[PDB]
PDB file of all heavy atoms in Angstrom:
ATOM      1  N   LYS U  53     -25.559  21.280   3.044  1.00 27.01           N
ATOM      2  CA  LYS U  53     -25.461  20.919   4.453  1.00 27.01           C
ATOM      3  C   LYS U  53     -26.762  20.341   5.005  1.00 27.01           C
ATOM      4  O   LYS U  53     -27.101  20.543   6.184  1.00 27.01           O
ATOM      5  CB  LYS U  53     -25.005  22.129   5.276  1.00 27.01           C
ATOM      6  CG  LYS U  53     -23.617  22.634   4.845  1.00 27.01           C
ATOM      7  CD  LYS U  53     -23.179  23.731   5.802  1.00 27.01           C
ATOM      8  CE  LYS U  53     -21.955  24.473   5.325  1.00 27.01           C
ATOM      9  NZ  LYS U  53     -21.302  25.165   6.480  1.00 27.01           N
ATOM     10  N   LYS U  54     -27.481  19.591   4.178  1.00 28.39           N
ATOM     11  CA  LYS U  54     -28.670  18.844   4.584  1.00 28.39           C
ATOM     12  C   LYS U  54     -29.823  19.753   4.993  1.00 28.39           C
ATOM     13  O   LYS U  54     -30.765  19.300   5.652  1.00 28.39           O
ATOM     14  CB  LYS U  54     -28.354  17.866   5.734  1.00 28.39           C
ATOM     15  CG  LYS U  54     -27.136  16.945   5.455  1.00 28.39           C
ATOM     16  CD  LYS U  54     -26.931  15.948   6.567  1.00 28.39           C
ATOM     17  CE  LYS U  54     -25.650  15.127   6.302  1.00 28.39           C
ATOM     18  NZ  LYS U  54     -25.304  14.295   7.491  1.00 28.39           N
ATOM     19  N   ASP U  55     -29.747  21.021   4.621  1.00 28.60           N
ATOM     20  CA  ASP U  55     -30.747  22.019   5.006  1.00 28.60           C
ATOM     21  C   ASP U  55     -32.055  21.731   4.283  1.00 28.60           C
ATOM     22  O   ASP U  55     -32.126  21.787   3.048  1.00 28.60           O
ATOM     23  CB  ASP U  55     -30.232  23.411   4.674  1.00 28.60           C
ATOM     24  CG  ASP U  55     -31.112  24.521   5.237  1.00 28.60           C
ATOM     25  OD1 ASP U  55     -32.188  24.742   4.669  1.00 28.60           O
ATOM     26  OD2 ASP U  55     -30.693  25.169   6.222  1.00 28.60           O
ATOM     27  N   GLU U  56     -33.100  21.456   5.064  1.00 30.10           N
ATOM     28  CA  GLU U  56     -34.355  21.015   4.488  1.00 30.10           C
ATOM     29  C   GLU U  56     -34.939  22.076   3.570  1.00 30.10           C
ATOM     30  O   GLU U  56     -35.338  21.779   2.438  1.00 30.10           O
ATOM     31  CB  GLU U  56     -35.341  20.661   5.600  1.00 30.10           C
ATOM     32  CG  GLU U  56     -36.671  20.205   5.055  1.00 30.10           C
ATOM     33  CD  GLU U  56     -37.618  19.670   6.119  1.00 30.10           C
ATOM     34  OE1 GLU U  56     -37.197  19.472   7.279  1.00 30.10           O
ATOM     35  OE2 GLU U  56     -38.781  19.425   5.762  1.00 30.10           O
ATOM     36  N   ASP U  57     -35.051  23.314   4.062  1.00 28.08           N
ATOM     37  CA  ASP U  57     -35.729  24.352   3.287  1.00 28.08           C
ATOM     38  C   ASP U  57     -34.976  24.622   1.982  1.00 28.08           C
ATOM     39  O   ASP U  57     -35.569  24.637   0.894  1.00 28.08           O
ATOM     40  CB  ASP U  57     -35.871  25.626   4.133  1.00 28.08           C
ATOM     41  CG  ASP U  57     -36.772  25.427   5.349  1.00 28.08           C
ATOM     42  OD1 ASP U  57     -37.526  24.414   5.342  1.00 28.08           O
ATOM     43  OD2 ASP U  57     -36.792  26.302   6.267  1.00 28.08           O
ATOM     44  N   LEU U  58     -33.651  24.791   2.069  1.00 26.64           N
ATOM     45  CA  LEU U  58     -32.865  25.105   0.881  1.00 26.64           C
ATOM     46  C   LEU U  58     -32.839  23.948  -0.104  1.00 26.64           C
ATOM     47  O   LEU U  58     -32.917  24.173  -1.316  1.00 26.64           O
ATOM     48  CB  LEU U  58     -31.444  25.504   1.264  1.00 26.64           C
ATOM     49  CG  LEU U  58     -31.341  26.772   2.121  1.00 26.64           C
ATOM     50  CD1 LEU U  58     -29.927  27.007   2.608  1.00 26.64           C
ATOM     51  CD2 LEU U  58     -31.861  27.987   1.342  1.00 26.64           C
ATOM     52  N   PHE U  59     -32.744  22.696   0.374  1.00 27.83           N
ATOM     53  CA  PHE U  59     -32.756  21.578  -0.558  1.00 27.83           C
ATOM     54  C   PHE U  59     -34.112  21.461  -1.266  1.00 27.83           C
ATOM     55  O   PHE U  59     -34.181  21.292  -2.490  1.00 27.83           O
ATOM     56  CB  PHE U  59     -32.412  20.253   0.150  1.00 27.83           C
ATOM     57  CG  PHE U  59     -32.555  19.074  -0.760  1.00 27.83           C
ATOM     58  CD1 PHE U  59     -31.565  18.753  -1.657  1.00 27.83           C
ATOM     59  CD2 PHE U  59     -33.745  18.356  -0.794  1.00 27.83           C
ATOM     60  CE1 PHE U  59     -31.720  17.732  -2.556  1.00 27.83           C
ATOM     61  CE2 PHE U  59     -33.909  17.329  -1.678  1.00 27.83           C
ATOM     62  CZ  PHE U  59     -32.900  16.996  -2.557  1.00 27.83           C
ATOM     63  N   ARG U  60     -35.212  21.543  -0.513  1.00 27.50           N
ATOM     64  CA  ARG U  60     -36.526  21.409  -1.131  1.00 27.50           C
ATOM     65  C   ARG U  60     -36.804  22.540  -2.108  1.00 27.50           C
ATOM     66  O   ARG U  60     -37.426  22.309  -3.158  1.00 27.50           O
ATOM     67  CB  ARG U  60     -37.613  21.338  -0.061  1.00 27.50           C
ATOM     68  CG  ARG U  60     -37.568  20.003   0.679  1.00 27.50           C
ATOM     69  CD  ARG U  60     -38.564  19.986   1.809  1.00 27.50           C
ATOM     70  NE  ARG U  60     -39.918  20.037   1.321  1.00 27.50           N
ATOM     71  CZ  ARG U  60     -40.981  19.994   2.116  1.00 27.50           C
ATOM     72  NH1 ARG U  60     -40.801  19.885   3.428  1.00 27.50           N
ATOM     73  NH2 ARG U  60     -42.203  20.050   1.612  1.00 27.50           N
ATOM     74  N   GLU U  61     -36.363  23.767  -1.767  1.00 30.85           N
ATOM     75  CA  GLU U  61     -36.469  24.890  -2.682  1.00 30.85           C
ATOM     76  C   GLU U  61     -35.625  24.673  -3.930  1.00 30.85           C
ATOM     77  O   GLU U  61     -36.095  24.940  -5.044  1.00 30.85           O
ATOM     78  CB  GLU U  61     -36.086  26.171  -1.949  1.00 30.85           C
ATOM     79  CG  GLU U  61     -37.190  26.532  -0.974  1.00 30.85           C
ATOM     80  CD  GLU U  61     -36.785  27.511   0.107  1.00 30.85           C
ATOM     81  OE1 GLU U  61     -35.740  28.203  -0.050  1.00 30.85           O
ATOM     82  OE2 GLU U  61     -37.542  27.572   1.112  1.00 30.85           O
ATOM     83  N   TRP U  62     -34.394  24.180  -3.767  1.00 33.08           N
ATOM     84  CA  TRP U  62     -33.557  23.898  -4.921  1.00 33.08           C
ATOM     85  C   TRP U  62     -34.243  22.885  -5.844  1.00 33.08           C
ATOM     86  O   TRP U  62     -34.216  23.021  -7.070  1.00 33.08           O
ATOM     87  CB  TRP U  62     -32.170  23.385  -4.461  1.00 33.08           C
ATOM     88  CG  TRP U  62     -31.423  22.781  -5.618  1.00 33.08           C
ATOM     89  CD1 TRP U  62     -30.652  23.441  -6.543  1.00 33.08           C
ATOM     90  CD2 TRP U  62     -31.410  21.403  -5.994  1.00 33.08           C
ATOM     91  NE1 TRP U  62     -30.182  22.548  -7.478  1.00 33.08           N
ATOM     92  CE2 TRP U  62     -30.628  21.293  -7.160  1.00 33.08           C
ATOM     93  CE3 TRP U  62     -31.984  20.251  -5.459  1.00 33.08           C
ATOM     94  CZ2 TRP U  62     -30.397  20.067  -7.788  1.00 33.08           C
ATOM     95  CZ3 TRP U  62     -31.771  19.034  -6.105  1.00 33.08           C
ATOM     96  CH2 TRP U  62     -30.976  18.965  -7.257  1.00 33.08           C
ATOM     97  N   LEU U  63     -34.892  21.873  -5.267  1.00 38.21           N
ATOM     98  CA  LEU U  63     -35.510  20.839  -6.079  1.00 38.21           C
ATOM     99  C   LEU U  63     -36.701  21.398  -6.840  1.00 38.21           C
ATOM    100  O   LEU U  63     -36.843  21.134  -8.039  1.00 38.21           O
ATOM    101  CB  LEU U  63     -35.918  19.666  -5.195  1.00 38.21           C
ATOM    102  CG  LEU U  63     -36.277  18.357  -5.867  1.00 38.21           C
ATOM    103  CD1 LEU U  63     -35.070  17.594  -6.371  1.00 38.21           C
ATOM    104  CD2 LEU U  63     -37.060  17.501  -4.872  1.00 38.21           C
ATOM    105  N   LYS U  64     -37.543  22.205  -6.176  1.00 37.31           N
ATOM    106  CA  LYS U  64     -38.626  22.902  -6.876  1.00 37.31           C
ATOM    107  C   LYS U  64     -38.074  23.760  -8.014  1.00 37.31           C
ATOM    108  O   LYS U  64     -38.578  23.729  -9.138  1.00 37.31           O
ATOM    109  CB  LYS U  64     -39.400  23.774  -5.884  1.00 37.31           C
ATOM    110  CG  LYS U  64     -40.485  24.645  -6.511  1.00 37.31           C
ATOM    111  CD  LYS U  64     -41.125  25.556  -5.466  1.00 37.31           C
ATOM    112  CE  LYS U  64     -42.252  26.392  -6.065  1.00 37.31           C
ATOM    113  NZ  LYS U  64     -41.864  27.037  -7.354  1.00 37.31           N
TER     114      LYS U  64
END
Side-chain angles (χ1 to χ4, degrees):
Chain U
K53 299 186 191 200
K54 309 184 184 171
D55 189 285
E56 180 172 350
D57 295 343
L58 297 173
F59 174 80
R60 288 175 66 178
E61 288 162 18
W62 166 85
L63 194 75
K64 175 185 182 313

